[PDB]
Amino acid sequence: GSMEFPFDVDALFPERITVLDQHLRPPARRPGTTTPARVDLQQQIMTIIDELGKASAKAQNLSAPITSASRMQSNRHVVYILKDAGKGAIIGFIKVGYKKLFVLDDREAHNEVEPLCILDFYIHESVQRHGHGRELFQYMLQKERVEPHQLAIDRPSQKLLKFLNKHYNLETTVPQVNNFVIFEGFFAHQ
Ligand SMILES: CC(C)(COP(=O)(O)OP(=O)(O)OC[C@H]1O[C@@H](n2cnc3c(N)ncnc32)[C@H](O)[C@@H]1OP(=O)(O)O)[C@@H](O)C(=O)NCCC(=O)NCCS
Ligand SMILES: [Br-]
Numbered sequence: 001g002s003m004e005f006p007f008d009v010d011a012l013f014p015e016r017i018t019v020l021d022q023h024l025r026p027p028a029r030r031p032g033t034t035t036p037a038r039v040d041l042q043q044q045i046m047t048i049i050d051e052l053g054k055a056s057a058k059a060q061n062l063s064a065p066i067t068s069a070s071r072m073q074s075n076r077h078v079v080y081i082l083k084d085a086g087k088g089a090i091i092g093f094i095k096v097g098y099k100k101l102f103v104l105d106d107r108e109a110h111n112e113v114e115p116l117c118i119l120d121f122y123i124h125e126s127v128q129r130h131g132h133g134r135e136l137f138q139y140m141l142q143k144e145r146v147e148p149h150q151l152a153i154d155r156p157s158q159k160l161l162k163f164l165n166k167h168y169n170l171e172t173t174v175p176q177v178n179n180f181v182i183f184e185g186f187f188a189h190q
Contacts, residue, residue, distance in 0.1 A: 002089045002124040003051060007044050009088030017139050018081040020045065022073050045069070049079065052093050056122035060157060067095050067120045077119060080140050082132060092123035094136045096144060101152055104176050105187050113190055115152045116144055117180070121160060134167050149185035156181050 014027055026041035035041070046069035053065035072079065077097040084091045099117045102110050123132045141148065148168035153160065164170040164183075172184035 001126055002084050002091050003055065004087060004089050005044070005048060005051070007087070009048075009083060009090060011088075012041060012044055012048075013081065013083045013088075016083060017136065018083065019143065020049075020072070020079050020081065022076060024049075024069065024072060048081070048090060049093075052079075052081070052090065052122065053120070055124070056093075056120055059122055059125065067093075078144075080136055080143070082123075082136050090124075091127060091132050092136065093120070094118070094122075094133075094140055095120040096140060099152070099154075101178065101180060103152070103178075103180070103182060103186075104174060106174055111187075111190070115150060115182075115186070116146050117152045117154055118156075118160075119154050133163055137163075137167070147189065149183050150189050151183070152186075153181045155179045 011029070011033070012026070014029060018027060024042050024045050026038055026045060029035060049067065049069045049072055053067035056067060057063075057065040067079070071077070075097065077095050079093050079095045081093045082091045083089070097117055097119050098114050100112065100114045101117075103113050105111060121133070123136075148164070148170055153164075156164070161181075170183040174182050174184065174186065176182065
């Protein structure tokens with residue numbers, strides 16, 4: 001069963017996919033809604049992002065999370081949170097950001113670029129492989145306004161590489177020495 005919290009997630013996140021940045025801005029509601037204080041709502045969001053980061057860390061066999069509320073506030077990352085039993089539940093998230101990279105082309109030459117990067121990506125195990133990952137990824141691409149092949153991927157797992165191959169035909173890679181993966185077509189757009 002997906003991730004449940006001691007507060008009303010549906011009240012907190014009206015949309016199915018919630019977009020948050022360093023501001024950690026609680027989504028607007030409608031007038032009928034009375035609301036808890038903003039500081040409290042932000043704390044709820046901070047807890048959600050902390051727990052998501054930890055769960056993603058467990059899924060990826062990481063000894064420490066790469067996504068946290070604290071990290072979100074001190075960086076320029078964007079998280080897209082997919083939400084799902086009165087309290088509501090969280091299915092998963094994807095986190096992106098622009099990063100400066102020293103990238104190898106097909107001629108083993110290093111190029112300074114700053115592409116959009118897929119930094120963290122997680123769907124709760126109970127409902128993995130149900131198409132939820134694609135749902136998040138499609139929404140992100142649209143909002144971020146980028147093509148799949150324009151992306152750099154930070155340490156992509158075996159699951160993600162299949163995911164990208166199936167859904168976007170990202171198959172051929174240009175080997176890197178950092179732990180980022182780029183795909184054929186990455187440099188044409190550069
Ligand atoms: C990677 C992840 C976000 C994929 O999201 P998802 O909701 O499972 O993916 P979707 O259901 O939208 O797409 C299904 C496709 O993803 C890939 N995939 C998902 N789970 C897989 C598994 N257990 N084994 C192999 N491929 C898998 C496959 O290509 C699959 O297609 P298929 O089922 O027809 O073979 C999710 O599986 C996950 O959270 N994995 C663990 C954390 C992780 O690896 N994150 C990325 C690290 S950079
Ligand atoms: Br973060």
